[PDB]
DNA sequence: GCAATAAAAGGGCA
DNA sequence: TGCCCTTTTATTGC
C-alpha cells in the first residue's frame, strides 16, 4: 500500500489501558525505584521501563497510558510490563481495554518543497505561519491526520489510531508535494 | 533548547 | 465547563 515506494517510520505509539483496580500512587512511588511522582505538578506515577522504551503515567483510576514505543505491538507489550510492574507491587491489576490512541510516523521524500506555494494552494487544510513554527500544517480531512511539512523534504505524520491511516495521509499527500518541490 | 502537532489520562483553576 | 497540568516522538530555525 506504498505506490510512492517510501513507508513512514513509525516514531511514537500513545495507548491507554485500564488496570481496572484503583491504585495508591504514593504506595507505588514509594516501592518503586523507576518511579516519579508528585500531585503538585501532575495526578500520576510516571515510571519508564528499558525495553521497549517507554513512559507510563499511571494514574489512581487504575487507567495507564503508554508512551514512546515504536510500533502497536511494543507498545501493548510495555504495558503488559507496566501492569506486571503494579501487580508484582501489590495491585490486583487486570488489563483491559487496551486501544491504540495516538500514532507518530515520519519519513523523507529527499527533495526541496516550496511550503508557501503549497500552503496557499491548499488554504482549506494548510496553517503555515513560519516565524511561529517553521513547519507547514496540512490538516487533512480523509483520513483525518495532520501533518508536519518541512521545506527539507522530511514530513510528520500525526493524530492515526491504525498505522494505514498514517500511510494512506503519506500517500495523499506525495503528489501534492511533488507538485511544489523547490527547483 | 524552544517553537507546534496529535493523543490519552487527572487534579486544579477562573 | 474548558483548558492546562505531564509524557512521548518526529521536525527546522531561531
Known amino acids: 500500500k506504498h505506490?510512492?515506494?517510501?513507508?513512514?517510520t513509525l516514531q511514537n505509539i500513545?495507548?491507554?489501558?485500564?488496570?481496572?483496580?484503583?491504585?495508591?500512587?504514593?504506595?507505588?512511588?514509594?516501592?518503586?525505584?523507576?518511579?516519579?511522582?508528585?500531585?503538585?505538578?501532575?495526578?500520576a506515577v510516571?515510571?519508564?521501563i528499558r525495553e521497549p522504551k517507554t513512559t507510563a503515567l499511571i494514574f489512581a483510576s487504575g487507567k495507564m497510558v503508554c508512551t514512546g514505543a515504536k510500533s502497536e505491538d511494543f507498545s501493548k507489550m510495555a504495558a503488559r510490563?507496566?501492569?506486571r510492574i503494579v501487580q508484582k507491587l501489590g495491585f490486583p491489576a487486570?488489563?483491559?481495554?487496551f486501544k491504540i490512541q495516538n500514532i507518530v510516523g515520519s519519513c523523507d521524500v529527499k527533495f526541496p518543497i516550496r511550503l508557501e506555494?503549497?500552503?496557499?494552494?491548499?488554504?482549506?487544510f494548510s496553517?503555515?505561519?513560519?516565524?511561529?513554527?517553521?513547519?507547514?500544517?496540512?490538516?487533512?480531512?480523509?483520513?483525518?491526520?495532520?501533518?508536519?511539512?518541512?521545506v527539507s523534504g522530511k514530513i510528520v505524520i500525526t493524530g492515526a489510531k491504525m498505522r494505514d491511516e498514517?500511510?494512506?495521509?503519506?500517500?495523499?499527500?506525495?503528489?501534492?508535494?511533488?507538485?511544489?518541490?523547490?527547483?
Not at 3 to 8: F, H, K, L, N, T
Not at 27 to 38: C, F, G, K, T
Not at 117 to 124: C, I, K, P, Q, V
Open 3 to 8: 505506490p510512492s515506494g517510501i513507508v513512514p
Open 14 to 43: 500513545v495507548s491507554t489501558v485500564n488496570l481496572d483496580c484503583k491504585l495508591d500512587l504514593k504506595a507505588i512511588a514509594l516501592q518503586a525505584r523507576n518511579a516519579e511522582y508528585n500531585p503538585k505538578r501532575f495526578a
Open 46 to 48: 510516571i515510571m519508564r
Open 81 to 83: 510490563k507496566y501492569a
Open 94 to 97: 487486570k488489563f483491559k481495554d
Open 117 to 124: 506555494g503549497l500552503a496557499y494552494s491548499h488554504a482549506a
Open 127 to 150: 496553517s503555515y505561519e513560519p516565524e511561529l513554527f517553521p513547519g507547514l500544517i496540512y490538516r487533512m480531512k480523509v483520513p483525518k491526520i495532520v501533518l508536519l511539512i518541512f
Open 166 to 183: 498514517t500511510y494512506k495521509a503519506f500517500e495523499n499527500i506525495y503528489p501534492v508535494l511533488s507538485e511544489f518541490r523547490k527547483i
